[PDB]
Design a protein around this nucleic acid. Sequence first.
RNA 1: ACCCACUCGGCACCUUACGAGAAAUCAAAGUCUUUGGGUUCUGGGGGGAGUAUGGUCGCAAGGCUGAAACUUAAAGGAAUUGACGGAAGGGCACCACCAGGAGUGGAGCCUGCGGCUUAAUUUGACUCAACACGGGGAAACUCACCAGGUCCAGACACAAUAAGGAUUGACAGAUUGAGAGCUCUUUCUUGAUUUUGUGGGUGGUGGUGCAUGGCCGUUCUUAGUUGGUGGAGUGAUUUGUCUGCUUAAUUGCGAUAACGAACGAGACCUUAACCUACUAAAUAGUGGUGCUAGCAUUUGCUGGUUAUCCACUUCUUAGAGGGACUAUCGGUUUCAAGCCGAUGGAAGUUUGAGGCAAUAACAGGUCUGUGAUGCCCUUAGACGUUCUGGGCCGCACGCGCGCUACACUGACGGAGCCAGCGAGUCUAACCUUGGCCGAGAGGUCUUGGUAAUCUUGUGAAACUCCGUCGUGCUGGGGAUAGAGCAUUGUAAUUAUUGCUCUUCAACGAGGAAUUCCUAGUAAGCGCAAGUCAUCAGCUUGCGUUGAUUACGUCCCUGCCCUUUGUACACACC
Lengths: 64, 71
Amino acid sequence: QPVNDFIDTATRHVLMRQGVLGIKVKIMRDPAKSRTGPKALPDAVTIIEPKEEEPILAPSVKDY
Amino acid sequence: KKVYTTPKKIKHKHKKVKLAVLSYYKVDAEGKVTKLRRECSNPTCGAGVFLANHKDRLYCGKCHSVYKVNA
RNA sequence: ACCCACUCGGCACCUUACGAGAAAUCAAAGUCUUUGGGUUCUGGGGGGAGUAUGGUCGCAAGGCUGAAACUUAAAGGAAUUGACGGAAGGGCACCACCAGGAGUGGAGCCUGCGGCUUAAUUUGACUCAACACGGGGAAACUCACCAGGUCCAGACACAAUAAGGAUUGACAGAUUGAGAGCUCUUUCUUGAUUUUGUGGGUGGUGGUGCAUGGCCGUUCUUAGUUGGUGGAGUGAUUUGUCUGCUUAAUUGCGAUAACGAACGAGACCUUAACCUACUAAAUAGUGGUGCUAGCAUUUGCUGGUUAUCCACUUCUUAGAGGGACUAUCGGUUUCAAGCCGAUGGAAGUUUGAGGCAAUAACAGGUCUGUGAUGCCCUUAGACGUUCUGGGCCGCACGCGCGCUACACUGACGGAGCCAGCGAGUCUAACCUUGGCCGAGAGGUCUUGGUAAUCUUGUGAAACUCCGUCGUGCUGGGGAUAGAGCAUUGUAAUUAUUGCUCUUCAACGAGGAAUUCCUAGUAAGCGCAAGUCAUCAGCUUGCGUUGAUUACGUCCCUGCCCUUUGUACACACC
Ligand SMILES: [Zn+2]
């Protein structure tokens, strides 16, 4: 389905003194930018990078 | 392919003749004009066009074919 | 005799590589541009050619010594990637077997192909990958073919004709299939729009799919392509991309000079499955109430009432969501990927079925889809176009897809009675209920529906039930054929289709061979849609009834993959 979602096909018949020849153009647009529709390939699986913790420390509480 | 046959005699066309025609307009010894060949009376051709004279025939020409008055 | 250590001189292997090489490789083929231990021999592009000539040797066959003229841009070596093999080892697959099923192959007809026939019987396609294919079910049309008849719709330029008329049309007649003024008889007309000629154009289902585009089919029911850093090689290149294992998969695990990726597979999309959970609805439906019929009657049971109200969303519909991730446990294997089994579950075979789908190849098919197109051919007695009639259907025969059957798990006749995918009329006559008429086909009078609203619950068929027949070419079977009625259509003869009576063929399970198929699948059964004025024995889909046999393998076949050879590379055509 990304085909439909992203790549663009075009066939054009240019004709010259010797015969004709065909142009087949393909353009895959950046899934990122997207605007409207899915912004990424079904392939894609980003993992969000966690954080180095500074754990330990004996309990305690705080009042407001 | 094959090319050519024919039992000969190739169809001509239509000559349409020549003529210096419309002589028919007799004017006497200066200068009275009485026309020749009687004219049609169909309001499409206002009595300018005339009628051919064959046997049994007073035929309207401008009326491309039409109307067959006879006398 | 054996054991162990050492030493000479041997026939060899092993691993290395400081070093050498063009490389393959080499303890010499090393110590060689940092170029010198001693010495003998041979070679100087290929072919001509070890040929000619002389000399010498031999019994001979022949041995040694050994040219040139001319010709030629290459010949050749080692390696690499590819392509191929009538060479080896592995796999995969019902377009392969196994185990089975239903058959085809025999019959009648239907239908395409060949052949023949023919004025013509238009043509492309000939193993899988041609032959119910060109959406190719041709009465005209379609139409490309054959017998014949018109028309120019020959832009444009120059030139020639000519306003005393360049040119157009035509009544009747003759003529023609024809109410074609095609042609001619005759003679009105028209007005510079045409005619003739040259160049130049155009149309063409004319040729070339071996000139092309595009499109399609095939390899492929396949699993392959690539690049970054790193290792090897002067290099083209190689490793990654691998012995094994495991998957439908270059799908993974694992081994490991490779590490981490990208296209392709997977993801994704579409549909069938689940949702008493959300949003709802007289174009969907349910429950209650009115209103009303029948039977019971004791309350009840079975219907009617396109809005009489009220309520609802289980069923129906389609929006957003949830849901499966082979889960939980346990077998089995390098306890890895996974695979097997039980349980649960709407569903655990990629959940079932499809859509897409990389790189590369074929002189596969299509100039008969295109106002897609190069070139060639034709262009007025046309290979343009249109009109009439015929033909693609012609029949000693060969082949392929089929349809109907040989009956008693059956035919017939009553009767029971159930689906899902669809589609339907504007500048029109499409889907058609209902009422009458007819044995029938059909006619006729109205009607709803541009549609979840009407056709239509598409009351389809196999099938279920009670009869009749009783194994006999029988009442199985329905070919061939005569006669009569209707419908489509301008037209039905060579008989479009439908109807009724009669005629009552072959076929008594089918040789050698051969196709398809593993679950709501096979096969049996009928629809709807395409085509369509009329015509399905075709196809695309659809639901109805619903088995047997595997859950395996490499024997036949087909194809992939490594190993190996190669003098191929326009690549075994
Ligand atoms: Zn007149």
